[PDB]
């Protein structure tokens, strides 16, 4: 149970179609900055190297 929204209230037939998708840690915590775009030196200036979890999300 939750407070309904105006975007849901007009579509009273598709209430089984709305879905909230959260993206959390395996331990259900907040995703830090170490799993996504780990820093790595390449040449003169550094650049964030994307990992596989970024391309999965």
C-alpha distances out from residue 56 to 1, 23, 29, 50, 51, Å: 30, 11, 18, 11, 9
Q: Could you say whether residue 25 binds another protein (CB under 8 A)? A: no
Contact status: 36 vs another protein (CB under 8 A): yes
Question: Minimal CA–CA distance to 19: which of 27, 30, 10, 8?
Answer: 8
Tell me if 33 contacts another protein by CB under 8 A.
Answer: yes
The smaller minimum CB distance to another protein, of residues 3 and 40, is found at: 40
Residues that bind another protein (CB under 8 A): 23, 31, 33, 36-37, 41, 44-46, 48, 54, 57
């Amino acid at each position: 149970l939750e407070t309904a929204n105006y975007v849901v209230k007009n579509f009273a037939e598709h209430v089984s179609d709305f879905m909230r998708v959260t993206f959390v840690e395996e331990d259900w915590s907040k995703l830090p900055a170490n799993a996504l775009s780990v820093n790595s030196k390449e040449g003169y200036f550094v650049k964030p190297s994307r990992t596989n979890i970024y391309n999965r999300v």
